[PDB]
Symmetry: none
Subunit: 227 residues, 2 copies
Protein backbone atom coordinates (compact mmCIF):
# COMPACT_ATOMS: atom_id res chain seq x y z
CA UNK A 1 0.00 0.00 0.00
CA UNK A 2 2.88 2.32 0.94
CA UNK A 3 5.16 0.41 -1.46
CA UNK A 4 5.67 2.48 -4.63
CA UNK A 5 3.88 5.34 -2.85
CA UNK A 6 6.77 6.46 -0.62
CA UNK A 7 9.00 5.23 -3.48
CA UNK A 8 8.32 8.53 -5.26
CA UNK A 9 9.88 10.78 -2.64
CA UNK A 10 12.86 8.45 -3.13
CA UNK A 11 13.19 9.57 -6.74
CA UNK A 12 13.27 13.27 -6.09
CA UNK A 13 14.61 13.67 -2.54
CA UNK A 14 17.38 11.37 -3.82
CA UNK A 15 17.77 12.91 -7.27
CA UNK A 16 17.45 16.32 -5.68
CA UNK A 17 20.55 15.52 -3.56
CA UNK A 18 22.95 14.92 -6.41
CA UNK A 19 21.56 18.15 -7.86
CA UNK A 20 22.61 20.12 -4.79
CA UNK A 21 25.92 18.31 -4.41
CA UNK A 22 27.20 18.48 -7.99
CA UNK A 23 26.22 22.17 -7.94
CA UNK A 24 29.00 22.85 -5.41
CA UNK A 25 31.35 20.16 -6.75
CA UNK A 26 31.88 21.70 -10.15
CA UNK A 27 31.47 25.20 -8.64
CA UNK A 28 34.81 25.23 -6.79
CA UNK A 29 36.53 23.03 -9.43
CA UNK A 30 35.78 26.10 -11.50
CA UNK A 31 37.51 28.39 -8.98
CA UNK A 32 40.76 26.41 -8.72
CA UNK A 33 40.67 26.08 -12.53
CA UNK A 34 40.79 29.90 -12.65
CA UNK A 35 43.65 30.23 -10.13
CA UNK A 36 45.26 27.04 -11.44
CA UNK A 37 44.77 28.97 -14.71
CA UNK A 38 47.19 31.48 -13.20
CA UNK A 39 49.53 28.58 -12.42
CA UNK A 40 50.12 28.68 -16.17
CA UNK A 41 49.62 32.43 -16.46
CA UNK A 42 52.67 33.51 -14.42
CA UNK A 43 54.54 30.47 -15.69
CA UNK A 44 53.91 32.16 -19.05
CA UNK A 45 55.21 35.59 -18.01
CA UNK A 46 58.29 34.08 -16.39
CA UNK A 47 58.58 31.78 -19.37
CA UNK A 48 58.93 35.00 -21.36
CA UNK A 49 61.60 37.15 -19.64
CA UNK A 50 63.45 33.83 -19.15
CA UNK A 51 63.52 32.18 -22.60
CA UNK A 52 64.27 35.76 -23.50
CA UNK A 53 67.56 35.75 -21.59
CA UNK A 54 68.38 32.58 -23.46
CA UNK A 55 68.10 34.51 -26.70
CA UNK A 56 70.16 37.22 -25.08
CA UNK A 57 73.20 35.49 -23.64
CA UNK A 58 73.01 33.17 -26.65
CA UNK A 59 73.25 36.26 -28.84
CA UNK A 60 76.19 38.13 -27.38
CA UNK A 61 77.84 34.74 -27.89
CA UNK A 62 77.84 34.99 -31.67
CA UNK A 63 79.37 38.47 -31.37
CA UNK A 64 82.20 37.45 -29.01
CA UNK A 65 82.68 34.67 -31.56
CA UNK A 66 83.51 37.45 -34.04
CA UNK A 67 85.79 39.57 -31.89
CA UNK A 68 87.87 36.46 -32.56
CA UNK A 69 87.47 36.15 -36.35
CA UNK A 70 89.01 39.55 -37.05
CA UNK A 71 91.82 38.54 -34.72
CA UNK A 72 92.12 35.44 -36.87
CA UNK A 73 92.22 37.65 -39.95
CA UNK A 74 95.12 39.37 -38.14
CA UNK A 75 96.92 36.12 -37.50
CA UNK A 76 96.34 35.31 -41.13
CA UNK A 77 97.69 38.70 -42.17
CA UNK A 78 100.72 38.00 -40.00
CA UNK A 79 101.23 34.73 -41.86
CA UNK A 80 100.83 36.25 -45.31
CA UNK A 81 103.29 39.05 -44.44
CA UNK A 82 105.66 36.45 -43.09
CA UNK A 83 105.47 34.18 -46.14
CA UNK A 84 106.84 37.20 -47.97
CA UNK A 85 109.89 37.62 -45.78
CA UNK A 86 110.77 34.09 -46.73
CA UNK A 87 111.68 35.73 -49.98
CA UNK A 88 113.62 38.76 -48.71
CA UNK A 89 115.32 36.18 -46.57
CA UNK A 90 116.01 34.02 -49.68
CA UNK A 91 117.10 37.00 -51.79
CA UNK A 92 119.58 38.03 -49.11
CA UNK A 93 120.80 34.44 -49.14
CA UNK A 94 121.64 34.87 -52.80
CA UNK A 95 123.40 38.13 -52.61
CA UNK A 96 125.47 36.85 -49.67
CA UNK A 97 126.83 34.26 -52.06
CA UNK A 98 128.74 31.52 -50.24
CA UNK A 99 127.56 32.69 -46.80
CA UNK A 100 123.97 32.38 -47.90
CA UNK A 101 123.85 28.61 -47.35
CA UNK A 102 122.47 29.10 -43.83
CA UNK A 103 120.44 32.16 -44.75
CA UNK A 104 119.04 30.00 -47.55
CA UNK A 105 117.75 27.30 -45.37
CA UNK A 106 116.08 29.60 -42.84
CA UNK A 107 114.23 31.19 -45.75
CA UNK A 108 112.64 27.87 -46.52
CA UNK A 109 112.06 27.17 -42.81
CA UNK A 110 110.34 30.47 -42.66
CA UNK A 111 108.10 30.11 -45.67
CA UNK A 112 107.29 26.66 -44.42
CA UNK A 113 105.94 27.69 -41.00
CA UNK A 114 104.15 30.54 -42.72
CA UNK A 115 102.19 27.95 -44.67
CA UNK A 116 101.53 25.77 -41.64
CA UNK A 117 100.45 28.78 -39.65
CA UNK A 118 98.23 30.00 -42.46
CA UNK A 119 96.72 26.54 -42.75
CA UNK A 120 95.95 26.56 -39.00
CA UNK A 121 94.15 29.91 -39.30
CA UNK A 122 91.98 28.68 -42.20
CA UNK A 123 90.77 25.59 -40.34
CA UNK A 124 89.92 27.62 -37.26
CA UNK A 125 88.22 30.08 -39.60
CA UNK A 126 85.92 27.79 -41.58
CA UNK A 127 85.28 26.29 -38.19
CA UNK A 128 84.67 29.50 -36.23
CA UNK A 129 82.17 30.63 -38.91
CA UNK A 130 80.56 27.32 -39.74
CA UNK A 131 79.88 27.25 -36.04
CA UNK A 132 78.07 30.60 -35.80
CA UNK A 133 75.89 29.21 -38.57
CA UNK A 134 74.38 26.79 -36.09
CA UNK A 135 74.16 29.55 -33.42
CA UNK A 136 71.79 31.52 -35.60
CA UNK A 137 69.74 28.44 -36.51
CA UNK A 138 69.27 27.75 -32.82
CA UNK A 139 69.04 31.44 -31.99
CA UNK A 140 66.06 31.59 -34.35
CA UNK A 141 64.14 28.60 -33.02
CA UNK A 142 64.46 29.73 -29.39
CA UNK A 143 63.50 33.27 -30.53
CA UNK A 144 60.33 31.98 -32.16
CA UNK A 145 59.16 29.69 -29.33
CA UNK A 146 59.47 32.71 -27.03
CA UNK A 147 56.46 34.19 -28.85
CA UNK A 148 54.32 31.08 -28.47
CA UNK A 149 54.03 32.45 -24.91
CA UNK A 150 52.12 35.71 -25.33
CA UNK A 151 49.60 33.31 -26.90
CA UNK A 152 49.64 30.85 -23.98
CA UNK A 153 48.56 33.93 -21.94
CA UNK A 154 45.67 34.74 -24.33
CA UNK A 155 44.37 31.16 -24.31
CA UNK A 156 44.63 30.78 -20.55
CA UNK A 157 43.22 34.29 -20.16
CA UNK A 158 39.97 32.75 -21.39
CA UNK A 159 40.01 29.79 -19.01
CA UNK A 160 39.58 32.82 -16.68
CA UNK A 161 36.56 34.20 -18.51
CA UNK A 162 34.85 30.83 -19.10
CA UNK A 163 35.53 29.54 -15.55
CA UNK A 164 34.47 32.97 -14.32
CA UNK A 165 31.01 32.32 -15.77
CA UNK A 166 30.47 28.86 -14.35
CA UNK A 167 31.07 30.69 -11.04
CA UNK A 168 28.11 33.02 -11.71
CA UNK A 169 25.91 30.81 -13.95
CA UNK A 170 26.49 27.63 -11.91
CA UNK A 171 25.94 29.89 -8.90
CA UNK A 172 22.41 30.42 -10.20
CA UNK A 173 22.02 26.64 -10.06
CA UNK A 174 21.39 27.12 -6.35
CA UNK A 175 19.03 30.10 -6.86
CA UNK A 176 17.13 27.95 -9.33
CA UNK A 177 17.58 24.46 -7.83
CA UNK A 178 16.21 26.14 -4.73
CA UNK A 179 12.87 27.21 -6.07
CA UNK A 180 12.70 23.72 -7.50
CA UNK A 181 13.10 22.38 -3.98
CA UNK A 182 10.02 24.40 -3.12
CA UNK A 183 8.15 22.35 -5.69
CA UNK A 184 9.39 18.95 -4.57
CA UNK A 185 8.31 20.33 -1.25
CA UNK A 186 4.75 21.49 -2.01
CA UNK A 187 4.43 18.52 -4.39
CA UNK A 188 5.00 16.19 -1.52
CA UNK A 189 2.55 17.82 0.91
CA UNK A 190 -0.23 17.49 -1.65
CA UNK A 191 0.75 14.08 -2.83
CA UNK A 192 0.37 13.92 0.93
CA UNK A 193 -2.79 15.51 2.30
CA UNK A 194 -4.39 13.61 -0.52
CA UNK A 195 -3.75 10.25 1.18
CA UNK A 196 -5.13 11.85 4.34
CA UNK A 197 -8.31 13.16 2.74
CA UNK A 198 -8.60 9.78 1.19
CA UNK A 199 -8.37 8.09 4.57
CA UNK A 200 -10.52 10.48 6.56
CA UNK A 201 -13.14 10.16 3.86
CA UNK A 202 -12.79 6.37 3.50
CA UNK A 203 -13.31 6.51 7.23
CA UNK A 204 -16.40 8.63 7.69
CA UNK A 205 -17.89 6.42 4.94
CA UNK A 206 -17.42 3.32 7.08
CA UNK A 207 -18.73 5.16 10.14
CA UNK A 208 -22.03 5.89 8.39
CA UNK A 209 -22.45 2.35 7.18
CA UNK A 210 -22.34 1.48 10.89
CA UNK A 211 -24.66 4.22 12.16
CA UNK A 212 -26.97 3.30 9.34
CA UNK A 213 -26.59 -0.38 10.11
CA UNK A 214 -27.72 0.46 13.66
CA UNK A 215 -30.85 2.22 12.75
CA UNK A 216 -31.67 -0.89 10.69
CA UNK A 217 -31.24 -2.92 13.86
CA UNK A 218 -33.35 -0.77 16.17
CA UNK A 219 -36.07 -0.97 13.58
CA UNK A 220 -35.88 -4.75 13.27
CA UNK A 221 -36.09 -4.90 17.06
CA UNK A 222 -38.26 -2.08 18.24
CA UNK A 223 -40.65 -2.25 15.31
CA UNK A 224 -41.81 -5.53 16.84
CA UNK A 225 -44.97 -3.46 17.35
CA UNK A 226 -45.03 -5.13 13.98
CA UNK A 227 -43.86 -8.53 15.34
Amino acid sequence: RTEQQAASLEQTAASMEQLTATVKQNAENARQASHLALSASETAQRGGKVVDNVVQTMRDISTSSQKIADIISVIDGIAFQTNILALNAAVEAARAGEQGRGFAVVAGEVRNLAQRSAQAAREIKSLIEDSVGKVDVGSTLVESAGETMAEIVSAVTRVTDIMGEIASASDEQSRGIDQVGLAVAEMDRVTQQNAALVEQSAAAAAALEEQASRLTEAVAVFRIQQQ
Copy 2:
Protein backbone atom coordinates in the same frame (compact mmCIF):
# COMPACT_ATOMS: atom_id res chain seq x y z
CA ALA B 1 1.25 29.92 -12.38
CA SER B 2 3.87 28.53 -9.94
CA LEU B 3 4.08 24.95 -11.28
CA GLU B 4 4.71 26.91 -14.49
CA GLN B 5 7.14 29.32 -12.87
CA THR B 6 9.05 26.38 -11.35
CA ALA B 7 8.89 24.42 -14.62
CA ALA B 8 10.32 27.58 -16.19
CA SER B 9 13.25 27.66 -13.81
CA MET B 10 13.33 23.94 -14.45
CA GLU B 11 14.43 23.92 -18.12
CA GLN B 12 16.23 27.23 -17.61
CA LEU B 13 18.34 24.97 -15.44
CA THR B 14 18.43 22.40 -18.23
CA ALA B 15 19.82 25.36 -20.15
CA THR B 16 22.81 26.43 -18.10
CA VAL B 17 23.59 22.79 -17.30
CA LYS B 18 23.90 22.07 -21.05
CA GLN B 19 26.11 25.01 -21.94
CA ASN B 20 27.68 25.57 -18.50
CA ALA B 21 28.43 21.87 -18.94
CA GLU B 22 30.05 21.67 -22.36
CA ASN B 23 30.88 25.37 -22.68
CA ALA B 24 33.54 24.22 -20.24
CA ARG B 25 34.23 21.13 -22.31
CA GLN B 26 35.41 23.63 -24.93
CA ALA B 27 37.71 24.99 -22.21
CA SER B 28 38.92 21.37 -21.83
CA HIS B 29 40.17 21.88 -25.39
CA LEU B 30 41.25 25.55 -25.16
CA ALA B 31 43.31 23.78 -22.49
CA LEU B 32 44.31 20.64 -24.38
CA SER B 33 45.44 23.19 -26.99
CA ALA B 34 47.02 25.68 -24.51
CA SER B 35 49.09 22.48 -23.91
CA GLU B 36 50.23 22.08 -27.54
CA THR B 37 52.18 25.38 -27.68
CA ALA B 38 53.37 24.44 -24.21
CA GLN B 39 54.62 21.15 -25.74
CA ARG B 40 56.46 23.32 -28.31
CA GLY B 41 59.21 24.56 -26.00
CA GLY B 42 59.51 20.83 -25.25
CA LYS B 43 61.77 20.53 -28.30
CA VAL B 44 62.30 24.13 -29.48
CA VAL B 45 64.15 24.31 -26.19
CA ASP B 46 65.28 20.70 -25.81
CA ASN B 47 67.11 21.05 -29.16
CA VAL B 48 68.65 24.30 -28.03
CA VAL B 49 70.47 22.34 -25.29
CA GLN B 50 72.11 20.27 -28.04
CA THR B 51 73.66 23.21 -29.86
CA MET B 52 74.75 24.43 -26.45
CA ARG B 53 76.55 21.14 -25.87
CA ASP B 54 78.04 21.74 -29.29
CA ILE B 55 79.58 25.12 -29.32
CA SER B 56 80.88 24.21 -25.86
CA THR B 57 82.93 21.51 -27.62
CA SER B 58 83.64 22.89 -31.08
CA SER B 59 84.83 26.15 -29.55
CA GLN B 60 87.37 23.96 -27.74
CA LYS B 61 88.37 22.03 -30.86
CA ILE B 62 89.33 25.54 -31.95
CA ALA B 63 91.42 26.40 -28.90
CA ASP B 64 93.35 23.28 -29.83
CA ILE B 65 94.22 24.73 -33.17
CA ILE B 66 95.07 27.99 -31.45
CA SER B 67 97.63 26.04 -29.45
CA VAL B 68 99.23 24.67 -32.64
CA ILE B 69 99.46 28.19 -33.97
CA ASP B 70 101.10 29.12 -30.72
CA GLY B 71 103.60 26.38 -31.13
CA ILE B 72 104.34 27.62 -34.60
CA ALA B 73 104.81 31.14 -33.34
CA PHE B 74 107.28 29.68 -30.82
CA GLN B 75 109.16 27.78 -33.43
CA THR B 76 109.48 30.67 -35.81
CA ASN B 77 110.71 32.72 -32.83
CA ILE B 78 113.48 30.18 -32.15
CA LEU B 79 114.13 30.02 -35.91
CA ALA B 80 114.32 33.77 -36.07
CA LEU B 81 116.72 33.79 -33.08
CA ASN B 82 118.96 31.31 -34.80
CA ALA B 83 118.65 33.22 -38.06
CA ALA B 84 120.30 36.16 -36.19
CA VAL B 85 123.30 34.14 -35.07
CA GLU B 86 123.58 33.05 -38.63
CA ALA B 87 123.70 36.67 -39.63
CA ALA B 88 126.30 37.25 -36.93
CA ARG B 89 128.42 34.49 -38.47
CA ALA B 90 128.40 36.04 -41.97
CA GLY B 91 129.84 39.14 -40.32
CA GLU B 92 129.37 41.92 -42.87
CA GLN B 93 126.95 40.31 -45.29
CA GLY B 94 124.77 39.53 -42.33
CA ARG B 95 123.58 43.10 -41.81
CA GLY B 96 120.58 42.59 -44.04
CA PHE B 97 119.76 39.14 -42.78
CA ALA B 98 120.08 40.52 -39.27
CA VAL B 99 117.11 42.71 -40.01
CA VAL B 100 115.20 39.89 -41.62
CA ALA B 101 115.98 37.90 -38.51
CA GLY B 102 114.48 40.60 -36.32
CA GLU B 103 111.57 41.14 -38.60
CA VAL B 104 110.82 37.49 -38.47
CA ARG B 105 111.08 37.39 -34.70
CA ASN B 106 108.71 40.32 -34.31
CA LEU B 107 106.26 38.55 -36.51
CA ALA B 108 106.56 35.55 -34.16
CA GLN B 109 105.88 37.69 -31.10
CA ARG B 110 102.88 39.33 -32.67
CA SER B 111 101.58 35.98 -33.80
CA ALA B 112 101.94 34.81 -30.20
CA GLN B 113 99.99 37.57 -28.40
CA ALA B 114 97.13 37.25 -30.87
CA ALA B 115 96.77 33.58 -29.89
CA ARG B 116 96.99 34.38 -26.22
CA GLU B 117 94.08 36.88 -26.70
CA ILE B 118 92.03 34.36 -28.67
CA LYS B 119 92.67 32.06 -25.70
CA SER B 120 91.43 34.40 -23.01
CA LEU B 121 88.56 35.56 -25.13
CA ILE B 122 87.59 31.90 -25.72
CA GLU B 123 87.71 31.22 -21.99
CA ASP B 124 85.20 33.88 -21.10
CA SER B 125 83.02 32.93 -24.04
CA VAL B 126 82.74 29.15 -23.73
CA GLY B 127 82.55 29.83 -19.94
CA LYS B 128 79.18 31.45 -20.73
CA VAL B 129 77.90 28.23 -22.25
CA ASP B 130 77.59 27.82 -18.48
CA VAL B 131 74.68 30.29 -18.19
CA GLY B 132 73.54 28.61 -21.40
CA SER B 133 73.07 25.22 -19.84
CA THR B 134 71.43 27.21 -16.99
CA LEU B 135 68.94 29.52 -18.71
CA VAL B 136 68.21 26.49 -20.94
CA GLU B 137 67.27 24.38 -17.94
CA SER B 138 65.43 27.36 -16.36
CA ALA B 139 63.70 28.59 -19.52
CA GLY B 140 63.21 24.87 -20.24
CA GLU B 141 61.61 24.44 -16.82
CA THR B 142 58.87 27.12 -16.80
CA MET B 143 58.03 25.42 -20.11
CA ALA B 144 57.15 22.18 -18.23
CA GLU B 145 55.72 24.20 -15.30
CA ILE B 146 53.48 25.71 -17.98
CA VAL B 147 52.29 22.27 -19.07
CA SER B 148 51.37 21.65 -15.41
CA ALA B 149 48.39 23.95 -14.81
CA VAL B 150 47.12 22.92 -18.26
CA THR B 151 47.41 19.17 -17.40
CA ARG B 152 44.70 20.08 -14.88
CA VAL B 153 42.49 22.54 -16.74
CA THR B 154 42.02 19.74 -19.29
CA ASP B 155 41.27 17.55 -16.25
CA ILE B 156 38.90 19.81 -14.23
CA MET B 157 36.94 20.70 -17.40
CA GLY B 158 36.74 17.08 -18.53
CA GLU B 159 35.69 16.25 -14.97
CA ILE B 160 32.81 18.75 -14.55
CA ALA B 161 31.38 17.98 -17.96
CA SER B 162 31.18 14.25 -17.13
CA ALA B 163 29.46 15.41 -13.90
CA SER B 164 26.90 17.82 -15.35
CA ASP B 165 26.01 15.08 -17.84
CA GLU B 166 23.86 13.54 -15.09
CA GLN B 167 23.17 16.93 -13.54
CA SER B 168 20.60 16.73 -16.36
CA ARG B 169 19.08 13.32 -15.79
CA GLY B 170 18.15 14.21 -12.22
CA ILE B 171 16.97 17.72 -13.15
CA ASP B 172 15.03 15.67 -15.71
CA GLN B 173 13.62 13.12 -13.24
CA VAL B 174 12.74 15.79 -10.71
CA GLY B 175 10.85 17.69 -13.39
CA LEU B 176 8.55 14.72 -14.07
CA ALA B 177 7.64 14.11 -10.45
CA VAL B 178 6.69 17.72 -9.75
CA ALA B 179 4.46 17.74 -12.85
CA GLU B 180 1.52 16.04 -11.13
CA MET B 181 1.51 18.69 -8.41
CA ASP B 182 -1.09 20.81 -10.10
CA ARG B 183 -3.11 17.75 -11.04
CA VAL B 184 -2.95 16.28 -7.59
CA THR B 185 -4.22 19.48 -6.15
CA GLN B 186 -7.49 19.28 -8.12
CA GLN B 187 -7.57 15.66 -7.03
CA ASN B 188 -7.61 17.00 -3.43
CA ALA B 189 -9.91 19.94 -4.04
CA ALA B 190 -12.46 17.42 -5.35
CA LEU B 191 -12.12 15.30 -2.19
CA VAL B 192 -12.63 18.40 -0.12
CA GLU B 193 -15.78 19.04 -2.08
CA GLN B 194 -17.26 15.65 -1.42
CA SER B 195 -16.40 16.14 2.23
CA ALA B 196 -18.37 19.40 2.40
CA ALA B 197 -21.34 17.65 0.75
CA ALA B 198 -21.00 14.75 3.09
CA ALA B 199 -20.93 17.13 6.04
CA ALA B 200 -23.97 18.94 4.83
CA ALA B 201 -26.03 15.80 4.10
CA LEU B 202 -25.22 14.65 7.60
CA GLU B 203 -25.69 18.15 8.96
CA GLU B 204 -29.26 18.03 7.90
CA GLN B 205 -30.09 14.35 8.20
CA ALA B 206 -29.26 14.90 11.86
CA SER B 207 -31.70 17.77 12.51
CA ARG B 208 -34.32 15.75 10.69
CA LEU B 209 -33.85 13.41 13.64
CA THR B 210 -32.95 15.68 16.59
CA GLU B 211 -36.22 17.51 15.81
CA ALA B 212 -38.29 14.33 15.62
CA VAL B 213 -36.89 13.51 19.06
CA ALA B 214 -38.10 16.95 19.99
CA VAL B 215 -41.74 16.23 19.22
CA PHE B 216 -41.80 12.91 21.13
CA ARG B 217 -40.11 14.79 23.99
CA ILE B 218 -43.04 17.16 24.54
CA GLN B 219 -45.57 14.97 22.76
CA GLN B 220 -44.88 12.56 25.68
CA GLN B 221 -44.35 15.13 28.44
